[PDB]
Ligand binder design. Structure first.
Ligand SMILES: *[C@@H]1O[C@H](CO)[C@@H](O[C@@H]2O[C@H](CO)[C@@H](O)[C@H](O)[C@H]2NC(C)=O)[C@H](O)[C@H]1NC(C)=O
Ligand SMILES: *[C@@H]1O[C@H](CO)[C@@H](O[C@@H]2O[C@H](CO)[C@@H](O)[C@H](O)[C@H]2NC(C)=O)[C@H](O)[C@H]1NC(C)=O
Ligand SMILES: *[C@@H]1O[C@H](CO)[C@@H](O[C@@H]2O[C@H](CO)[C@@H](O)[C@H](O)[C@H]2NC(C)=O)[C@H](O)[C@H]1NC(C)=O
Ligand SMILES: *[C@@H]1O[C@H](CO)[C@@H](O[C@@H]2O[C@H](CO)[C@@H](O)[C@H](O)[C@H]2NC(C)=O)[C@H](O)[C@H]1NC(C)=O
Ligand SMILES: *[C@@H]1O[C@H](CO)[C@@H](O[C@@H]2O[C@H](CO)[C@@H](O)[C@H](O)[C@H]2NC(C)=O)[C@H](O)[C@H]1NC(C)=O
Ligand SMILES: *[C@@H]1O[C@H](CO)[C@@H](O[C@@H]2O[C@H](CO)[C@@H](O)[C@H](O)[C@H]2NC(C)=O)[C@H](O)[C@H]1NC(C)=O
Ligand SMILES: *[C@@H]1O[C@H](CO)[C@@H](O[C@@H]2O[C@H](CO)[C@@H](O)[C@H](O)[C@H]2NC(C)=O)[C@H](O)[C@H]1NC(C)=O
Ligand SMILES: *[C@@H]1O[C@H](CO)[C@@H](O[C@@H]2O[C@H](CO)[C@@H](O)[C@H](O)[C@H]2NC(C)=O)[C@H](O)[C@H]1NC(C)=O
Ligand SMILES: *[C@@H]1O[C@H](CO)[C@@H](O[C@@H]2O[C@H](CO)[C@@H](O)[C@H](O)[C@H]2NC(C)=O)[C@H](O)[C@H]1NC(C)=O
Ligand SMILES: *[C@@H]1O[C@H](CO)[C@@H](O[C@@H]2O[C@H](CO)[C@@H](O)[C@H](O)[C@H]2NC(C)=O)[C@H](O)[C@H]1NC(C)=O
Ligand SMILES: *[C@@H]1O[C@H](CO)[C@@H](O[C@@H]2O[C@H](CO)[C@@H](O)[C@H](O)[C@H]2NC(C)=O)[C@H](O)[C@H]1NC(C)=O
Ligand SMILES: *[C@@H]1O[C@H](CO)[C@@H](O[C@@H]2O[C@H](CO)[C@@H](O)[C@H](O)[C@H]2NC(C)=O)[C@H](O)[C@H]1NC(C)=O
Ligand code: NAG
Ligand code: NAG
Ligand code: NAG
Ligand code: NAG
Ligand code: NAG
Ligand code: NAG
Lengths: 4, 471, 471, 471, 4, 4
């Protein structure tokens, strides 16, 4: 639910 | 001459008995009528208020976890959901899938009421986090219910206005993310990725529906929700089929038709496919788990044997079956009569009028922050309230007119506070409850009042006809 | 054979007369029913609109007073309210206590409609401050009523939409405080310390309740309040007990149940304790003063004789008694039947739908500010509109694309304007008034229609029984 | 003894027949009563949603036109409207006059749904600009209607909540103006000069009234409009006079009383003066043009012969006549009975509850902007989304804690996005339709039930009286 | 509707 | 109602  | 007498008597008897049959038929169809009246003397039951954070996860706890070494599961989970291909890729690029496939970490990441609710005041008396019952909702992870009907019996308003009502200074804890991290916008989700508080003002003792029935509220504004109480009382058998029952769910809820529909949808989903949806109310039925749970996702990510190629599709059969059944239920209301269920004989609803205002004034921001610290925050120097309070305290204690820098400090403090803080008043505008009572359209007393005058004489004339006929 | 005749006649007579008695009993209980109908032809009475500034005091007048030497009382009052200990310390660290213990200075500090209302337009015709009647309300010091029923008889809407309705460009006059000064956040106050305008859309000729019945509106947004008119007409004796009376208060108000309850609460408070509350409507009864008035507070602060130790408690008996009586009244509705009072036979309410939008566009901000100056501001170079207008005018007259600085100037002008200015439209969405009329459930004409057919024959048969009985 | 018999029979007959006459008279006045009932099983028809941009013109297209050489007309028009004196100077310093006196350029300047609607999602299924029918409205130039009743038959909600409903990510395209250009604030206009989207949630197949019936919505906030469906069914002849007709206007609209009033106002305006108003619904009647059209304004501006002095008054007779007739119609409702028209026998309205929240979170802004580009924007490097996406992408890919600059970049991206973008959810809170059905107060079956018992015997006794009288 |  |  969250990338870098 | 008696022939005319007999003929006119017969005609009159047929007319009168057809009229009586029409009346008793009108009574046989047990019609009802809703009568609305404004009762200004009945005591008003203060609603149940469920506050949820629109952002389920907290970036602060996430950052703390990465600084420590207990985020591995999350670090694995992301590494898993972003390496393999999955159908409904938007679902498992979301936070609900993160909750479903590893619940404990989702709880550890979700918001806490302590950190969320910064000041509470009900009926001019201070209230704490001990007046809110916690509960869980996927995509609205932690939802806290004031006047939930469990800690105390029920709450009543004997006074109107925002002074005699719930007042919540809530910090949405909108914390800046990790230096090189951005969230994934789930475009199949019409309610998330927003800053604010999702408030459900629902009947006391009834399960909250933060998605369907909640209304959202923005940070940096004091939003006042004035409530007008509507009491809809229905008729039981034989006029109707309402019952004064209680829904089961996780915990005994006061019956509402929509909540029962959601529960029977969840039960139908549990029956059709052997999984459960986090969108619907939880049921906790062994050994049913959440739909969209990949049971061996840790084993799949741990590429111990190389049968899992990069970007390979992962089946997720249960998720697809849940999507199919949910689509069929959402696009067809015929299920509503299968699980049946009934409207609560007595239901309480509220017309809410929400009006917001810019809060807090820059004048009172320092005096606010001082008390919020003095009551709730002994730690976390790397916090918005602390950085904002530093600015405001150096403004108020310099040791004329604000300098550009002074103005910059005041503005930065105001932006921090109004990005994170919001006041929410929930109150009864008036104690006049609008009661819609279902009444028998043709009461039995009305039937007697409309038949007896005829019937008393005409049974006697029927006896006369008998005596004249066969004797 | 006449025995059967007599018996059946007696049975029929008893049945018919019991039916008639049941009907006349149903009429004896003067029931009423509320019938709702949408009248699309009756003229709609435009409401009374009371605008209040959510921030009662004005920091500009405060700063002006300190620059001069007429603020001494205030400088004394603060110096007094902080040096000594007082019960309900939050009350007399607030602005309501400042009003109560020295009223004239509170008036001199409160907002003026000139400075507050910057542009008014009703029914496509320009309106000025001469259409608003001033009034006072503690914690909402100055409250100005358009269509208050005093200057003109009444106002009517013959046209819907925000074009044919009240439009108010209002500057909340949110001015930056003194360089080293911060306000005290009264945490026992759920409505203040916010920027915006408190609007009460109430029945024409009825006293406004800015606290209980108002809804707040934020600066920097054009907020449109669309109104749907509800006309509730009640029945007088014998069906009900409403009267077409008028409340007294300070000035003759059209009767509303809530306003009368507030007035009788104020009267009960005046009787039980010999003081008066600024929260409730004013009454101006000699020699009753406000509760929470320390009569010799100037003498106490002036430590002429040292019997007043530092941080010493100050009794404030009247304030405690007012708090006790207010708590008892707010937590118990039994008083509502003592002062009695009645619902207005004819009452007008409004369903308001408030929708806000970002106002004004940066495109039109300069053209706005030009007219606001050209009409209202000849002085005060140290004003937000002036600093904002300087930025916008240097943008529009440099003497491509906006430069970073140009962009910074535009942004700073927009923040100033939208921190201080707001548009408020109040209008009727539709001219169809929803009328709830109370009607006799069993009208006398209905009684006659339901008894006469029986009664005409059965009084005659009673005469027959008389003649057959004793002659 | 028969004298008493005759007298009592006559008295009873007169009483009974007067009662019957009273009943048939009560039926003769065809009274109606509105009965409200909550139907929880009838299918709910999803409304028609008309979104308009509160700013009619787009500064981007305007700037593009000046960079090219096709803006001459506009450059002429401004040069004309600002050189000659005109009555109602505020009208032709506005944008409506720009539309009226040169329509094609106004269309070329107005907003396009492509640029306006950035993401649409209805009933969990993606929707595009192909689901919105365009239409035109002066001062709200382009208005796009979802579920307009033309592309598809009708749309139905079988599911509640914001998930199963319309979701629109809309960019208001608020673009910074030309370097030395500022718009003119039309102070006779209570709705324009605001940033946001004007939303009309109206009955399906009924013409939208963006001015009168719309509610505005601000950028930078996800605003959720929960709808409760009200179905008002009326009675045709003889009880009422409603008809199931359809309005004509430009295109066949489902009949609503207000829309028909607007159309008959437009027709009355077309008759009284030979022009037409852009405020009212368009009619397209040859050879009628818009009121406030100066037919030779191009010739007047082109000072080919010097009879047009600087700052000279220009007549504009049609505009003055339109203002006169509009004032007379707005200040007097007597016209409502001339053009007559009738309420729709079946009408659908909605109680809307609008609740806004801060959107989007700074966490999800980059992931948003990525998809908005990937779907909609291949060009225009000089765009807000592009400048915002540059900031966010350099934050997320630097190649701890945010630096001041990093913080400045994040803040500038958030301000751009939240100045331009907004999410709008429109959904049904509940599928229980509140139906107000008009019913005969005294039904014919009720008349028969209330007369037959008497009538059957008393026609026979009338025959008895005949036989005893003349034979 | 817009000046310079 | 306001400190320094
Ligand atoms: C998911 O985790 C795997 C580790 O199991 C990552 O693969 C590593 O990537 C780095 C970066 O180039 C290499 O140096 C390692 O040799 C890789 N390990 C392998 C292939 O076993 C992978 O990049 C991660 N992916 C995501 C999206 O986070
Ligand atoms: C909020 O919670 C507090 C603490 O649970 C409640 O205070 C208690 O109230 C009960 C009666 O309801 C008393 O018997 C206890 O002595 C109280 N304890 C304390 C520490 O105050 C309070 O009533 C709750 N208020 C609401 C509105 O729910
Ligand atoms: C899982 O592991 C297998 C083998 O350990 C990987 O297959 C190799 O992947 C590399 C790329 O890193 C290729 O160069 C090789 O040709 C592949 N085959 C072999 C026999 O080494 C596979 O890519 C891994 N998959 C994931 C998702 O980690
Ligand atoms: C309870 O009573 C209601 C009465 O409204 C029933 O609702 C009807 O159910 C039938 C079943 O086929 C539908 O066809 C009707 O449209 C419903 N509404 C009506 C008649 O107004 C309901 O079925 C009853 N039972 C339950 C379990 O709710
Ligand atoms: C309230 O006013 C008194 C003055 O009557 C202040 O007392 C003075 O404080 C200054 C600052 O140290 C001293 O130099 C004076 O000698 C004091 N005068 C006295 C004690 O008579 C007091 O500080 C003020 N307090 C507040 C909270 O404003
Ligand atoms: C607003 O106030 C103005 C001035 O008090 C009103 O204008 C007056 O209206 C009366 C009739 O109501 C006339 O007799 C006067 O000649 C008018 N005077 C001026 C200077 O215009 C106006 O009617 C008020 N409007 C509203 C809506 O209250
Ligand atoms: C009121 O005045 C008395 C005396 O004028 C003050 O009492 C003295 O306070 C000082 C502190 O400033 C002490 O050092 C003395 O010991 C006190 N006693 C005497 C006899 O001087 C008293 O503090 C004053 N109180 C206030 C609120 O101003
Ligand atoms: C006016 O009539 C109303 C009728 O509703 C009276 O209201 C009732 O008052 C009694 C007094 O004890 C209460 O017990 C009831 O609960 C009230 N409501 C009812 C009966 O619906 C009211 O008392 C009358 N008098 C006044 C002064 O309002
Ligand atoms: C409208 O356009 C006319 C051109 O027809 C402008 O008049 C010109 O103004 C410039 C600037 O001083 C002069 O150099 C020209 O000689 C003028 N031309 C004439 C008078 O024919 C006029 O200024 C424009 N006005 C506006 C408000 O745009
Ligand atoms: C939105 O518009 C699309 C395209 O016009 C609609 O999709 C079509 O729907 C019809 C039936 O309504 C089908 O026969 C077509 O095959 C569909 N075409 C495509 C390309 O999908 C869609 O139904 C509309 N949705 C709504 C809610 O109006
Ligand atoms: C239209 O043109 C006439 C003549 O071409 C203008 O009249 C002259 O205006 C100038 C000002 O620019 C004066 O100095 C002259 O005295 C005027 N008269 C003559 C005979 O030249 C007139 O001003 C123009 N009007 C507009 C609106 O452009
Ligand atoms: C349709 O029926 C309505 C019934 O309400 C008529 O409305 C009345 O019209 C008369 C005409 O002079 C008005 O005086 C009344 O005030 C109206 N309302 C009532 C009686 O409640 C209407 O005129 C009829 N015809 C049309 C074309 O609407
Ligand atoms: C679910 O699985 C568990 C495995 O431990 C089993 O014991 C249990 O019986 C199963 N549920 C049912 C209803 O059989
Ligand atoms: C992964 O596969 C999907 C379809 O199977 C494709 O759309 C996507 O581009 C692929 N991504 C990568 C990084 O190979
Ligand atoms: C209130 O006090 C004043 C003192 O001037 C006195 O004259 C008056 O009579 C008092 N009020 C009453 C009701 O006695
Ligand atoms: C004043 O006294 C109160 C209680 O009497 C105490 O709480 C407070 O801390 C004291 N303040 C000072 C400055 O002495
Ligand atoms: C309007 O003007 C045109 C001019 O081309 C003319 O042909 C037409 O007949 C006119 N309209 C009517 C109704 O006569
Ligand atoms: C134009 O004329 C009007 C009135 O005729 C006047 O108010 C205005 O000031 C004049 N403007 C110029 C630039 O002459």
């Amino acid at each position: 639910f969250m990338r870098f | 001459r008696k022939v005319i007498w007999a003929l006119m008597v017969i005609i009159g008897f047929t007319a009168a008995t057809l009229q009586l049959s029409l009346l008793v038929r009108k009574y046989l169809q047990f019609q009802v009528v809703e009568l609305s009246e404004i009762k200004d003397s009945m005591p008003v039951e203060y609603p149940s208020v469920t506050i949820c954070n629109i952002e389920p996860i907290s970036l602060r706890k996430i950052r703390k976890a990465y600084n420590k070494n207990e985020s591995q599961n999350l670090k694995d989970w992301l590494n898993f959901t972003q390496t393999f291909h999955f159908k409904d890729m938007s679902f498992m690029n979301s936070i609900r899938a993160f909750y479903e496939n590893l619940g404990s970490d989702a709880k550890k990441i979700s918001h806490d009421l302590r950190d969320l609710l910064i000041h509470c005041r009900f009926n001019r008396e201070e209230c704490t986090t001990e007046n809110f019952t916690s509960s869980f909702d996927g995509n609205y992870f932690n939802c806290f219910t004031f006047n939930g009907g469990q800690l105390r019996d029920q709450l009543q308003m004997h006074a109107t206005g925002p002074e005699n009502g719930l007042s919540l200074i809530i910090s949405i804890e909108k914390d800046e993310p990790l230096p090189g991290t951005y969230g994934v916008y789930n475009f199949e989700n019409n309610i998330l990725h927003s800053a604010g508080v999702r408030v459900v003002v629902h009947a006391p003792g009834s399960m909250p529906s933060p998605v369907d029935h909640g209304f959202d509220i923005p940070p940096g504004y004091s939003s006042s929700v004035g409530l007008k109480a509507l009491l809809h009382t229905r008729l039981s058998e034989p006029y109707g089929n309402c019952t004064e029952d209680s829904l089961e769910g996780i915990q005994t809820y006061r019956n509402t038709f929509f909540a029962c529909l959601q529960l029977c949808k969840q039960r139908r989903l549990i029956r059709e496919c052997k999984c459960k949806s986090s969108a619907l109310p939880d049921l906790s039925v062994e050994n049913i788990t959440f739909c969209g749970v990949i049971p061996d996702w840790k084993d799949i990510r741990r590429n111990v044997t190389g049968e899992y190629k990069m970007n390979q599709t992962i089946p997720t059969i249960s998720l697809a079956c849940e999507a199919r059944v949910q689509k069929q239920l959402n696009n067809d209301r015929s299920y509503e009569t299968e699980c049946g269920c009934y409207q609560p004989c007595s239901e309480t609803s509220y017309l809410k009028s929400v009006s917001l205002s810019y809060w807090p004034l820059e004048f009172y921001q320092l005096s606010a922050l001082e008390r919020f610290f003095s009551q709730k925050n002994p730690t976390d120097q790397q916090h918005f309230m602390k950085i904002a309070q530093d600015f405001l305290s150096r403004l108020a204690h310099p040791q004329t007119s604000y300098s550009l820098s002074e103005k910059e400090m005041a503005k930065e403090a105001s932006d921090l506070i109004r990005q994170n803080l919001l006041r929410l008043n929930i109150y009864l505008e008036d104690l006049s409850v609008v009661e819609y009572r279902q009444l028998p359209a043709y009461g039995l007393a009305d039937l007697f009042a409309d038949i007896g005058g005829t019937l008393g004489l005409w049974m006697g004339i029927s006896v006369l006809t008998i005596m004249e006929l066969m004797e």
